[PDB]
Amino acid sequence: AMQSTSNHLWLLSDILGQGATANVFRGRHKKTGDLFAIKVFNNVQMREFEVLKKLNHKNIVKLFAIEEETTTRHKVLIMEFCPCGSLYTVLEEPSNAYGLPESEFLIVLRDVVGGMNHLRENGIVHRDIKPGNIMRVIGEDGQSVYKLTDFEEYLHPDMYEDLWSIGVTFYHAATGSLPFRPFEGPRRNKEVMYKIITGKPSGAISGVQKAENGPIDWSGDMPVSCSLSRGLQVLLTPVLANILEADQEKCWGFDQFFAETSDILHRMVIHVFSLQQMTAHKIYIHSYNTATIFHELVYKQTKIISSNQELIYEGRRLVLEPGRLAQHFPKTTEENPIFVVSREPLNTIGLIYEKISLPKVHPRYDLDGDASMAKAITGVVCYACRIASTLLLYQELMRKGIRWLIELIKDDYNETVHKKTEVVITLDFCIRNIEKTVELGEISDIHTKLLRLSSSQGTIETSLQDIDSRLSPGGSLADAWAHQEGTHPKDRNVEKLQVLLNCMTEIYYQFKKDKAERRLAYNEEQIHKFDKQKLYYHATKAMTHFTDECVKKYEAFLNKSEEWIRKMLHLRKQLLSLTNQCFDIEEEVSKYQEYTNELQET
Ligand SMILES: Nc1nc2oc3ccc(C4CCS(=O)(=O)CC4)cc3c(=O)c2cc1C(=O)O
C-alpha cells in the first residue's frame, strides 16, 4: 500500500522526516527512476510555491515541481533528495559528539552563510534555523554540501515568550553540545532555560547548570573538548558572543555578521608546530597579509617574540621576509608544518585536553535509557580515540622536528669551521710572514698578541670539537631516545582503539534501532542485554589501553623532551658564543694584518 502521483510514487515505510505540517517520504519518478524527496501535506500557494521553484542556489534545496496526489488530491511538493540526512543526523554520530571536524565545520559555515545571503537578496526570513533545517548532500568532489529547505532550543528570548538560532547552531556544531542547558535538560527545567537566556551576560556564550536547581556555569570561550583549532576559536568566539544577547542595541545584524564571517572564510591556513612547547597550531591569515602579521598571530598563539621566531621547514631553516605575502608561503599540512623554535627558554606544555571518564552503565532494561547511555559512552571513546591520534601526531612531529633541528645545528657548526679556516689561514700567513722579515718592541708586542690569538683560537677549536662530540651518536644529545620512548605507528594504538570503537558504534546503531521499535521480543531482548554488557567490556578495554599505554608512553616522551630541550638550548648558546668569538677575532687579526706588515717608506 502506497500513495502515487502522475509522475512520482512513494512507499509509506520509506519515511524520512515527520513533522506537524506534513511528512516527507522517499519517492521515485514514474519515468526515470531517480529519487526525490516527496512532501505530502496532511491538510496564495500557487504563487508562493512557483516563486520557490526559480530559487536556484548551491546552499538551498531545489523545489522541482508541485503535483497533486491521486487518491487524496493533496498538494505534493517534489524536492531534491539528500541521502545523507540533515545536520542533526550528522551531529548524532559519535565522532561528532564533541564537535564537528574543523574542515567539516568550515563547510557548514560557508554553506549556511552563503545560503541565507541568497535568501536575503530575495527577502525570505528563515525564523527557525536548526541542524534539522540544514540538509547534507555529497558533492561531485566528495566534500559535503549543506542546503536549507524548510522555510524550542533555538528561540530568541523575546520570541521564547533571527541571528540567534545561527549562533546556537554554530556553537552546537563546534562543541557537539548546546550552549544553554539546565540540569534535567530543557524540559521541566524550561523556566530555568528562560532564566538562562534572560541572564544577558553579553560576552559569555555558554551556561551549564551542573546541579539540579543549582547555579549556571557561564563561559565566554569554547570548552576544552572543542575539536576546532585554537586559532579558529579566537575568530569564532566574538562572532557568537555578539549575536547571543537580547539587546538589539548590541546585536550585530546580518551586514556585520556577513562581513566578519566572510573575513574568516577568506583566510588560508598555515600549519605551525611549536617544537619547544610541543604544541601544534593553525594560523588563520589572509593570503594578502605580510609575514609580519603572520609572526604577530604566532605570538598571540604561542607567546614567542616575533624576532625570536626561528622557522624550520623540510629539513632546512626558513627565513620569512617581513613583506612576503601569505599566499607565497610553502604549502603546509598537519603532518608537514613549519616548526618554530626560539632562543629564549620556553615551558614544555604538550597537549591540553579534557580528561573524561566512562559514565557508569545502568542495568535497567530501558530502550531509551540504553540508547542515550550508548550515545554518550561511544562519543567518549571517539574523544579518547581522537586524543590518541593527536598524541601520536605530536610525537611523530616531535621526532621530525628534533631530527631536523640537530641537522640545522650541525649546519651552524659547519659554517663556524668555514670561518675558522679563514682565520687559521690568515693567522699562519701573518704570524710567519713576520718571522720572515725578522724597533724590537714593535715586533715583540705583536707576538705577545699573535700568540694570545692562536691560543684563544685553539680553545675555540677544542670547545668546538667538544660540540662535534655532542652532536655525534650517543654524545649526550642524540635524538635516539625519541624513537625509544613514546608511541609509534608500529604499535598501531590508534587502530586498536578504532577496532573497539566500531563494535561500540554497531551496538549503538543497533540500540538506536532498538529504540525505534517500541518493544522487543524475548529473543531480541536478550541480544539487546548481552550486547549492552559487551558495550562495557569494550569501553573498559579501550580506556585501559588508552591510559596504560598511550598516555604513559606520551608523558614519558614529553618528560624526556623537556630535558632534551634544555640541553639543546644550552649547546646553542655555546656554539653561538664560540662563533661570535670567531668573528671578533677575525677582525682582531684584521687590525694586525695591515698594521706592521705594511710599513711606510719611499
Ligand atoms: N529534501 C529532503 N531530503 C531528505 O533526505 C533524507 C535522506 C535520508 C534520511 C535518513 C538517513 C539515515 S537515518 O538514520 O534514517 C536518518 C535520516 C533523512 C532525509 C531527510 O530527512 C530529508 C529531508 C528533506 C527536506 O526537504 O525536508
Please specify the SSE layout and strand pairing.
Elements: E1 2-4, E2 8-18, E3 22-29, E4 35-41, H1 45-53, E5 63-68, E6 75-80, H2 87-92, H3 102-120, E7 134-138, E8 144-148, H4 157-160, H5 163-175, E9 180-181, H6 190-197, E10 206-208, E11 217-219, H7 230-241, H8 254-265, E12 267-274, E13 279-286, H9 291-302, E14 310-313, E15 316-318, E16 338-341, H10 367-437, H11 441-470, H12 493-516, H13 522-588, H14 590-593
Parallel strand pairs: 9-10, 12-16
Antiparallel strand pairs: 1-2, 2-3, 3-4, 4-6, 5-6, 7-8, 10-11, 12-13, 14-15, 14-16
Helix pairs in contact: 3-8, 10-11, 10-12, 10-13, 11-13, 12-13
Bound molecules: the ligand Nc1nc2oc3ccc(C4CCS(=O)(=O)CC4)cc3c(=O)c2cc1C(=O)O.
The site of the ligand Nc1nc2oc3ccc(C4CCS(=O)(=O)CC4)cc3c(=O)c2cc1C(=O)O has 16 residues, from strand 2 and strand 6.
Active site: 128 (proton acceptor)
Organism: Homo sapiens
Family: Belongs to the protein kinase superfamily. Ser/Thr protein kinase family. I-kappa-B kinase subfamily.
Strand line-up of the largest beta sheet: 1-2-3-4-6-5
Number of domains: 4
Largest sheet: 6 strands, antiparallel
Order of helices and strands: EEEEHEEHHEEHHEHEEHHEEHEEEHHHHH
Beta-strand percentage range: 5-15%
Modified residues (N6-methyllysine): 552
Active site: 128 (proton acceptor)
Cross-link (Glycyl lysine isopeptide (Lys-Gly) (interchain with G-Cter in ubiquitin)): 31, 360
Main location: cytoplasm
